[PDB]
Amino acid sequence: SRRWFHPNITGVEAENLLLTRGVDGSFLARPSKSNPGDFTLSVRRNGAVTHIKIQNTGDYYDLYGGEKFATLAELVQYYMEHIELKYPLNCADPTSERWFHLSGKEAEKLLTEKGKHGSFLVRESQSHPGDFVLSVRTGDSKVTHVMIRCQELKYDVGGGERFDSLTDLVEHYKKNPMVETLGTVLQLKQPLNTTRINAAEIESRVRELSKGFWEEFETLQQQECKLLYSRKEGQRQENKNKNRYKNILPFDHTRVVLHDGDPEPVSDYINANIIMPKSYIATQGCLQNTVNDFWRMVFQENSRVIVMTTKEVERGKSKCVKYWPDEYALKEYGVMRVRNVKESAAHDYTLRELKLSKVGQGNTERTVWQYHFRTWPDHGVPSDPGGVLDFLEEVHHKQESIMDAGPVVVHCSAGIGRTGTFIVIDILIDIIRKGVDCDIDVPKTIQMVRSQRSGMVQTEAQYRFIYMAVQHYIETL
Ligand SMILES: CC1(CN)CCN(c2cnc(Sc3cccc(Cl)c3Cl)c(N)n2)CC1
C-alpha cells in the first residue's frame, strides 16, 4: 500500500491522527522535520503514541532499537511479519501520487504533446476551488475532462459512490472505468509522464525544481511498494552471515549465482545483483568471510573494472575489508590468485591495476582495474559533481577499451545508496554520451534499477546530486 506514509504531517498531527482515527496497533511513518533526511515511525500502544526514529544518512534506513533496511516498505513488511504494527493508518493526501498535479489548457497540451491512449492526471479545479478534475486521453485522438466534486470531505464524479480520497476514487475507476454514453470507455491506463525531459532542458527543469525536488522524489518513493520481490536465498541459514546487513538482501531474480563452488552445501550466494538497464553488478563491501566469494564472482562474470566508492573505514566504522593485495604483492583468495601490479593515485581516487587468475592454470589471467573513489563526504553528497563525473568518464573508457569485458562491479558498504547513485549517473551520461538530442527520465531510471536491487538510490540529497551531475555533464558538452 505504502499509503501508511504521510509526506506532510507534523508529529502532533500524527499523534492525534493515530489517537482519533486509529486503534492500538495502528502505525504510520512520516518524514522527520527536526532532521532533514530522517523519518519517524509512529505507533499507537495502550492508547498512547510512541515515536521511533529512523535515520538514513545515505546508506540505509537505520531504525533505532531495531534493524537496518533497504526501503521503508521492506522495513514495514519485515515488522508486520515479525510494539506491534497491526493496522496501517493510511494517508489521504495525494501529493505523492504519479497522477496528481495545473491549468486545464496546459493539461490538454501535455496530454497532447506527451500522452497516449489512457494517459491521465488529476488537477485542482479552477472554476470551483476545492473540487478536482480528472483529465484523460483516449485515442489511436481525444482528451476528456471529468469533474470531481468535494462534498463533506468525500469525493465523487457526480454520481455513484463517494470516496474518502482521490487515490481511492482513482483506484476505483482504474478497475471500473467510466463509460460515456456513446461507448467511449475512459480507461485510466497510465499516469501522464511529466518527468521525462529532453537532455537540453535539464537546466530549465532543475531551476524550477529548486523553488519541487522534494515532491518528485517522494513521488518516486511511493512507488517502492511495487518492488517487494522475494529475497529468500539471502535469508537461508547458510547465507545469513554472508550479508553485511542481515535485512538488506538481493532479489532472487537478479542475484549473481556463483557456480563451480566447493562440493560445503551452499556455495552459490553473494550479496550482489546484476543491474541491466554496459551492465553492472551492485554489491556490498566485502566481509572477511566473503572475500573469496567476491573474487569468484569477478572471475566468473568476466568483470574487468571494479568501482569502490567508500574508504575502508569511515568515521571509525568499517565498510569494506581489504580484498586486494598490497602494491606489488601477491595473494591467494581461495582458488583465485590476485597480484596488485601497480597503483596510481589521483586526487579523488586511486587506480589499482590488479591481475586475476585461477590457481593452477595460467590461461585464465585477466587484468582487473579497481577504481577506488576516496573523496565522498562522510555524510551527504559532494558539493560538486566534477570529481564524480571525471571519475566515471575515466571508468567508462577503461571499460570500453577492453574487448568482451563483463559487468562493471560497483560496491560501497551496503551497496544501495552510493553504489546506486554512481550506476545511475553512469547510465544517464551513457545516454548523453546519442548526444544532447535525447530524453532523460531520472525517476524512471531509478525505478528500473530499484527493481533489480532493493533501495538502489537512498536519499533525496543523492537524487538531486544525480540531477546536478547530469546537468554538469551536459554543460560540458
Ligand atoms: C506533480 C507530482 C505530484 N505527485 C506528480 C508528477 N511527478 C512525478 C510522477 N511520477 C513519478 S515516478 C516514475 C516516473 C517515471 C517512470 C516511472 Cl517507472 C516512475 Cl515509477 C515521479 N517521481 N514524479 C512529480 C510530482
Curated annotation (Swiss-Prot):
CDD domains: PTPc-N11, SH2_C-SH2_SHP_like, SH2_N-SH2_SHP_like. Its EC number is 3.1.3.48. GO terms for molecular function: cadherin binding; cell adhesion molecule binding; insulin receptor binding; molecular adaptor activity; non-membrane spanning protein tyrosine phosphatase activity; peptide hormone receptor binding; phosphoprotein phosphatase activity; phosphotyrosine residue binding. GO terms for cellular component: cytoplasm; cytosol; mitochondrion; nucleoplasm; nucleus; protein-containing complex. It catalyses: O-phospho-L-tyrosyl-[protein] + H2O = L-tyrosyl-[protein] + phosphate. Keywords: Acetylation, Cytoplasm, Deafness, Disease variant, Hydrolase, Nucleus, Phosphoprotein, Protein phosphatase, Repeat, SH2 domain. Changing residue 273 to S: In NS1; some patients also manifest giant cell lesions of bone and soft tissue. The active site is at 412 (phosphocysteine intermediate). It is linked to LEOPARD syndrome 1: A disorder characterized by lentigines, electrocardiographic conduction abnormalities, ocular hypertelorism, pulmonic stenosis, abnormalities of genitalia, retardation of growth, and sensorineural deafness. Noonan syndrome 1: A form of Noonan syndrome, a disease characterized by short stature, facial dysmorphic features such as hypertelorism, a downward eyeslant and low-set posteriorly rotated ears, and a high incidence of congenital heart defects and hypertrophic cardiomyopathy. Other features can include a short neck with webbing or redundancy of skin, deafness, motor delay, variable intellectual deficits, multiple skeletal defects, cryptorchidism, and bleeding diathesis. Belongs to the protein-tyrosine phosphatase family. Non-receptor class 2 subfamily. This is Tyrosine-protein phosphatase non-receptor type 11. It comes from Homo sapiens. The gene is PTPN11.
